[PDB]
Amino acid sequence: GLIYAVGGYDGNTHLNSVEAYDPERNEWSLVAPLSTRRSGVGVAVLNGLIYAVGGYDGNTHLNSVEAYDPHHNEWSLVAPLSTRRSGVGVAVLNGLIYAVGGYDGNTHLNSVEAYDPERNEWSLVAPLSTRRSGVGVAVLNGLIYAVGGYDGNTHLNSVEAYDPHHNEWSLVAPLSTRRSGVGVAVLNGLIYAVGGYDGNTHLNSVEAYDPERNEWSLVAPLSTRRSGVGVAVLNGLIYAVGGYDGNTHLNSVEAYDPHHNEWSLVAPLSTRRSGVGVAVL
């Protein structure tokens, strides 16, 4: 029932710090830090553990992965990716962690790898049809959706979905707006694409995808522009954590109520964090 904000960039420093949000107290508290600084990190929850995948330590784009045990309040390294990946999208499906796309330091990636915690190993699965760093990823109805991103030359409005039973990606309806550094989460059978960067400006706009109609619709915009924003769903609300508003890196946090279709501010992070990974545990 807590939101964890993992790593990020405060405007000067790539962070190893981690903090947790308690909606009942409306308060953030620091927890144990990562072993390595990570901005542009992908985060996912599996088997009661938080996995921090890849990212950038201010020097090198990372293949390392570490896992957080809230009962020990400690991070431990697990098996590394086959490819260095910052700006990577991460989602959990059928007991596996998928690492989608990202940037290895010279190339924007279309490759995808999956982690099996039983074997503690990563293996490649089918690649994206499009290279995607800064990509948002979420799982809905047994499919993994890769939303937007940057292919090396263009900020993307395209969206594709992964079927693990066929080991195949398929294009679905594209966003109305190009978005890299976009935050994505799933709520009430819809995928929300939050903020991002369209190549011209950082965005406050938000779009929601309905798989039944295969179409995106705009919903209420954020109170502030946010790219590199972490997005997570808790208690029927969508939280947008941190990010970058085109001017500075943000410690502010807002929550979206789909019943009212409105965003409201909640308590801010102790630390400005763009390129932050967010997960609910």
CATH number at residue 163: 2.120.10.80
224 conformational bin, left if phi > 0, alpha if psi -120 to 50, beta if neither: beta
Is residue 118 packed enough to be buried (19+ CB in 10 Å), middle (13-18) or exposed (0-12)?
exposed
Write out the H or E segment, with its range, that includes residue 98.
Answer: strand 96-100
Tokens of 37: 């600084």
Task: List 146's β-bridge partners, or say none.
Answer: 137, 160
Is residue 126 packed enough to be buried (19+ CB in 10 Å), middle (13-18) or exposed (0-12)?
middle
Distance CA 104, CA 54 (A): 10
- Sign, CA dihedral 268-274-280-281, equals negative
Of 40, 136, 53, the residue nearest 89 (C-alpha): 136
Whose structure tokens read 């903090």?
Answer: 19
* Pair 38, 11: CB distance under 8 Å: no
Of 134, 106, 277, the residue nearest 202 (C-alpha): 134
Is residue 182 packed enough to be buried (19+ CB in 10 Å), middle (13-18) or exposed (0-12)?
buried
Which residues, including other chains, have CB under 8 Å from residue 233's CB and lie 6 or more apart? Answer: 185, 186, 187, 239, 280
Distance CA 243, CA 263 (A): 16
* Pair 75, 68: CB distance under 8 Å: yes
Parent domain of 165: 3-280
Tokens of 111: 């490759």
CA 31 to the chain's CA centroid: 20
* Pair 14, 250: CB distance under 8 Å: no
* Pair 50, 4: CB distance under 8 Å: yes
* Pair 133, 103: CB distance under 8 Å: yes
* Pair 261, 245: CB distance under 8 Å: no
Whose structure tokens read 């086959």?
Answer: 82
DSSP for 156-208, written as a single string: ---EEEEETTTTEEEE-PPPSS--BS-EEEEETTEEEEEEEE-SSSEEEEEEE
12 conformational bin, left if phi > 0, alpha if psi -120 to 50, beta if neither: alpha
> What DSSP designation does 121 have?
E
Dihedral angle of Cα 254, 144, 20, 264, to the nearest 10 degrees = 10
Q: State the alpha helices, DSSP H only, in the chain.
A: none
Distance CA 36, CA 229 (A): 20
Whose structure tokens read 């990372």?
Answer: 62
Of 260, 261, 192, the residue nearest 229 (C-alpha): 192
Tokens of 204: 């406050």
User: CA angle 211-114-89, nearest 5°?
Assistant: 55
Distance CA 102, CA 243 (A): 18
Of 138, 140, 143, the residue nearest 184 (C-alpha): 138
Tokens of 150: 């940057």
* Pair 256, 240: CB distance under 8 Å: yes
User: CA angle 3-256-29, nearest 5°?
Assistant: 25
Domains identified in the chain, total number: 1
Whose structure tokens read 């994505």?
Answer: 184
**Method used to obtain the model:** X-ray
Distance CA 250, CA 244 (A): 6
